[PDB]
Design a protein around this nucleic acid. Structure first.
Ligand SMILES: [Mg+2]
Ligand SMILES: [Mg+2]
Ligand SMILES: [Zn+2]
Ligand SMILES: [Zn+2]
Ligand SMILES: [Zn+2]
Ligand SMILES: [Zn+2]
Lengths: 162, 162
DNA sequence: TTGACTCTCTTAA
DNA sequence: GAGAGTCA
DNA sequence: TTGACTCTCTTAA
DNA sequence: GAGAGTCA
């Protein structure tokens, strides 16, 4: 809600509730042929999810609190960042999973960045494979690799140069 | 249905027309601090665009030919790939700009790949910076770099470990 | 047969 | 990746 | 007040 | 990144 104290209280109650989510160990590629381990705090697959939480989409949740007798509601991963600017360079800030695990609500696995920065982590070589993200990746992106391109650049005649 | 010969004729007429689009010389990052040059064949900003071409969105065009009284229409960048498989690994193939220049219709700047592969090229370090795409990038992706993350992973209490 | 517009849709963050 | 409404 | 559902929207390929 | 309709 409006006051800094009220926002800190929201963040604290969110952390206490998420802190009781099941902790699931995931072994992940780091890049450079190395492997690491992440501890994700995973929201349940079905109701009940935890105090304040409700599912608004297949992999979308919201956190809800009653303050000043009114309901305030946020996307479930946005709560850690309620005291941060909500835009950067005129682009909306978004919660970005460094563990690439939507059910995870561990704030140590989240950052707050443009949707472009967020998406781009899917292809990052990872913290041991050349990640250049200033807020460093926790793992190699799940889509990193050679790709599966069906056809490359080509011409039939002689009209074009690279 | 169109024969192979008819499809080749479509590709040939498309190439002939695109080959008369203005050719614009662009200096681009290749990765590794190197600069290179790409020559884009850019569709005009406003009508007329060229024989067979019409704009269906701000940066979307289509190519249309009438063969034996039947109107055939394709996305304007898909024509080079009409003799290729249209899906791979259960995903639809998309025209993917290696030059990251939507208006460009140079087929030497296009490849044919899943939408995920296509998107991921935006963040590639480039052919001189560590590109691992099997069909190699022509340039460093426009969104490559450290990013502009507003807030990193953080907690207020001690409920979490990474 | 053709040009120049119109509309909505897909994907996965 | 988001916001908001309908019920109990 | 709290829970468990419903709906549509944003972005840039 | 796509498909399709209307009108002259
Ligand atoms: Mg993400
Ligand atoms: Mg692209
Ligand atoms: Zn996680
Ligand atoms: Zn990274
Ligand atoms: Zn080009
Ligand atoms: Zn590449």
């Amino acid at each position: 809600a409006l006051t800094n104290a009220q926002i800190l209280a929201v963040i604290d109650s969110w952390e206490e509730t998420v802190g009781q989510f099941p902790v699931i160990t995931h072994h992940v590629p780091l890049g450079g042929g190395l492997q690491g381990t992440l501890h994700c705090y995973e929201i349940p697959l079905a109701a009940p999810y935890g105090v304040g939480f409700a599912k608004n989409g297949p992999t979308r949740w919201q956190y809800k609190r009653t303050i000043n007798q009114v309901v305030h509601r946020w996307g479930s991963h946005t709560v850690p960042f309620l005291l941060e600017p909500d835009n950067i360079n005129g682009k909306t800030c978004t919660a970005s999973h460094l563990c690439h695990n939507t059910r995870c609500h561990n704030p140590l696995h989240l950052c707050w960045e443009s949707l472009d920065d967020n998406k781009g982590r899917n292809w990052c070589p990872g913290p041991n494979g050349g990640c250049v993200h200033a807020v460093v990746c926790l793992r190699q992106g799940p889509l990193y690799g050679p790709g599966a391109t069906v056809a490359g650049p080509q011409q039939r005649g002689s009209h074009f140069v690279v």
